[PDB]
Write an enzyme that holds these catalytic residues in place. Structure first.
Site, PDB file in Angstrom:
ATOM      1  CD  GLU A  91      -2.178  -2.721  -5.681  1.00 34.84           C
ATOM      2  OE1 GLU A  91      -3.262  -3.326  -5.553  1.00 34.84           O
ATOM      3  OE2 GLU A  91      -1.241  -2.820  -4.861  1.00 34.84           O
ATOM      4  CG  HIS A 121      -7.278   5.238   5.084  1.00 37.41           C
ATOM      5  ND1 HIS A 121      -8.493   5.857   4.892  1.00 37.41           N
ATOM      6  CD2 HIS A 121      -6.828   4.902   3.851  1.00 37.41           C
ATOM      7  CE1 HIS A 121      -8.765   5.897   3.600  1.00 37.41           C
ATOM      8  NE2 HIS A 121      -7.771   5.324   2.947  1.00 37.41           N
TER       9      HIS A 121
END
Lengths: 147, 596
Positions: B357, B487
């Site tokens: 990230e 998910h």
């Protein structure tokens, strides 16, 4: 007016939320309707709708039919943070930030409260979007704005 | 005046919509960390998957055209990745019904009310956070039986729903060729409707005897050693005969076995190897202070330009004083504000996710004025280079130990060294069969034509090992809930790191023989490798149009023949890891192996 879309899920009987607790108090006998749809091309601008601002929390809950005409300085802490967003203190004013391509869950959702208000005067306002046609020279039943 | 210009305008509108939806996901989290409320979770269930419907439009113009053979390699790869075939067989009414069913069942599953501080260990396992703190208790019997009782009472009544889902799929699931949802992001991995780099029927019918029997003894030895370690190194509080505890896997899948290195310490109360001084004192992250302090004397004399102290403004308490239940949604608009959205806990999976990230946002500060087409890289090699490399470089404790900022209380013994060696040995061919078996399992299970007559041979271990559900006789098929786990919404399949099992090996050969720091070949030193992971940033902007990493086909070798030199290079280590334990039978694999 306009609100954030997520706050639609917040306004509920006995539920939490910004609008229900800090912005508007729901009447116990509210009578009316709220009409809302995506105002992406209407309530949002390409350049960024940064003009709108809101207040996170208020000391006293706003009463029904009361307008918050004050934007005084708020100090959430026990020490003079002088408006600095830090320990035990928050900045009272935040931006709304509406854009045209917002997602449905947080679009500038419309809010139209048609609160039926009983003041000390007889009725003078109506919404009669039902007026039908008219026929003559036949024994029928007729209504004209109450008569 | 032409349809091409209108199509380009619509594509730009779609890119703007995607960017604004990411900004929505960021801003909702910002507001709900600025206010004490949780209802935003509801928007996760309904709004998110709704966007998928819009994607349908693209398919309407993406199938019949022969445009799959663009001359440019980069453009062809991007179009292969972003325009997979998808599930376009459903009709509008059928799609609406399926979407409503998905929304209803996701709302039912994700609204688990039993997660509160008064609950000893039974919280919503779907959402991490405090769940891994209060549950750290020695009552393993409760931790297992309460969990199994909850699973039973939430899944027994859902059996008709799963049966109707299965029969609804089975009318056309024999020709849908849908295996993994992660292709939504990486559709170039698997090709549907025509042969590709994956295992076709002709290749599969041959690999089930050559590669399967070639790797079967290795997998047998590997999981026999794993079983020996689990029932012998750990105390025998329960009989090895019973099902293995699923809590050891950490996450729901357990694919990231390296997390065992993070959770190798039973204690959680006393301080551990982490920078927690600010968390104890100021209840906020302390890595930013270290980053600021590690830059005032690392100048290079005459830099071309400075991009290290853009945000010189001092900010204290950039958010909530007390952290609420954490949820991974890290994303920042940038250029007008920067706030930390991801929490920080004791998990290296979170560390690797946060490093990726941070790399992506560092890309964002430079590419916020760029189209979504070139905003993110195509090949996984770029993410691998800017991803786990930084984590491995920063994993060296020598830099933190030498300074001596904390108390001099440090402990290290032979067990830690052996655990480190085992973790390093888990990043080699040994891990390959474990993931390959899972991939093949997931590919076959979604066909519906494989005979179900036999279940003891290759299906008795599925219920005993993976899920650990206690049953008298595991002779059932209707219990396949993990195959449709939540998910699927976020597409968190780890196959994007598959090449890390091989490529990261070669890089080691580049350094382990060149630098050759003080220390034998047994433990290769990778110290001071952060500069190697940082020097790539000097030209990423320049090399946007000529990606050199995409040209080479070094990812795969030659499947048509057996490379003899690349099979006995590390034989002395492999045999040592193979025949070290005395309980491993040598020779032919017996048909009946109760302890295997």
């Amino acid at each position: 007016f306009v609100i954030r879309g997520n706050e639609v899920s917040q306004i509920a009987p006995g539920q939490t939320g910004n609008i229900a607790d800090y912005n508007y108090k729901l009447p116990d006998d509210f009578t009316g309707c709220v009409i809302a749809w995506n105002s992406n091309k209407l309530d949002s601008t390409v350049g960024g709708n940064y003009n709108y601002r809101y207040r996170l929390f208020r000391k006293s809950k706003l009463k029904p039919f009361e307008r918050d005409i004050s934007t005084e300085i708020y100090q959430a802490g026990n020490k003079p943070c002088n408006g600095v967003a830090g320990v035990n203190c928050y900045f009272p004013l935040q931006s709304y930030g509406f854009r045209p391509t917002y997602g449905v869950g947080h679009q500038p959702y419309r809010v139209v409260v048609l609160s039926f208000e009983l003041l000390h005067a007889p009725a003078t306002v109506c919404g009669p979007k039902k007026s039908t046609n008219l026929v003559k020279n036949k024994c029928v039943n007729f209504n004209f704005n109450g008569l | 005046s032409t349809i091409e210009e209108q199509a380009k305008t619509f594509l730009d509108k779609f890119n703007h919509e995607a960017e604004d939806l990411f900004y929505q996901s960021s801003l909702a989290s910002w507001n709900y960390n600025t206010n004490i409320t949780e209802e935003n979770v509801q928007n996760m269930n309904n709004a998110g998957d709704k966007w998928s419907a819009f994607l349908k439009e693209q398919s309407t113009l993406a199938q019949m055209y022969p445009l799959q053979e663009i001359q440019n390699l980069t453009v062809k790869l991007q179009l292969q990745a972003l325009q997979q075939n998808g599930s376009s067989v459903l009709s509008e009414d059928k799609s609406k019904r399926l979407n409503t069913i998905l929304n209803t069942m996701s709302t039912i599953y994700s609204t688990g009310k039993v997660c509160n501080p008064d609950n000893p260990q039974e919280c919503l396992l779907l959402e991490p956070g405090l769940n891994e703190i209060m549950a750290n208790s020695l009552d393993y019997n409760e931790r297992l039986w309460a969990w199994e009782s909850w699973r039973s009472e939430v899944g027994k009544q859902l059996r008709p729903l799963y049966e109707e889902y299965v029969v609804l799929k089975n009318e056309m699931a024999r020709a849908n060729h849908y295996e993994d949802y992660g292709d939504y992001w990486r559709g170039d991995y698997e090709v549907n409707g025509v042969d590709g780099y994956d295992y076709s029927r002709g290749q599969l019918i041959e690999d089930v005897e050559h590669t399967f029997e070639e790797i079967k003894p290795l997998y047998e030895h590997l999981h026999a050693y794993v079983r020996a370690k689990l029932m012998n190194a750990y105390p025998s509080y329960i009989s090895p005969i019973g099902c293995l505890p699923a809590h050891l896997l950490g996450d729901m899948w357990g694919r990231f076995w390296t997390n065992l290195y993070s959770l190798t310490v039973p204690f959680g109360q006393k301080p551990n190897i982490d920078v927690t001084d600010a968390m104890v004192d100021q209840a906020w992250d302390a890595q930013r202070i270290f980053k600021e302090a590690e830059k005032f004397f690392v100048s290079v004399g005459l830099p071309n330009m400075t991009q290290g102290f853009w945000e010189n403004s001092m900010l204290t308490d950039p958010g909530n004083v007390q952290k609420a239940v954490c949820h991974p949604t890290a994303w920042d608009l940038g250029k007008g504000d920067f706030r930390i959205l991801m929490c920080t806990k004791v998990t290296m999976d979170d560390f690797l996710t946060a490093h990726h990230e941070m790399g992506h946002i560092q890309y964002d500060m430079a590419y916020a004025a760029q189209p979504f087409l070139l905003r993110n890289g195509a090949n996984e090699g770029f993410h691998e280079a800017v991803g786990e490399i930084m984590s491995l470089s920063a994993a060296t404790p020598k830099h933190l130990k030498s300074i001596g900022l904390l108390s001099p209380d440090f402990q290290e013994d032979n067990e830690t060294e052996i655990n480190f060696l085992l973790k390093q040995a888990l990043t080699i061919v040994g891990t390959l069969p474990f993931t390959y078996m899972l991939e093949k399992w997931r590919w076959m299970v979604f066909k519906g034509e494989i005979p179900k007559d036999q279940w003891m041979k290759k299906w008795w271990e599925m219920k005993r090992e993976i899920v650990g559900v206690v049953e008298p006789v595991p002779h059932d098929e209707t219990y396949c809930d993990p195959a449709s786990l939540f998910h699927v919404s976020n597409d968190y399949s780890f196959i994007r790191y598959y090449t890390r099992t091989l490529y990261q090996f070669q890089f080691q050969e580049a350094l382990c023989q060149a630098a050759k720091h003080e220390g034998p070949l047994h433990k290769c030193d990778i110290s001071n490798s952060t500069e190697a992971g940082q020097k790539l940033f000097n030209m990423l902007r320049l090399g946007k149009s000529e990606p050199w990493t995409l040209a080479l086909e070094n990812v795969v070798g030659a499947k048509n023949m057996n490379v003899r030199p690349l099979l006995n290079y590390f034989e002395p280590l492999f045999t040592w890891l193979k025949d070290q334990n005395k309980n491993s039978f040598v020779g032919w694999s017996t048909d009946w192996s109760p302890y295997a």
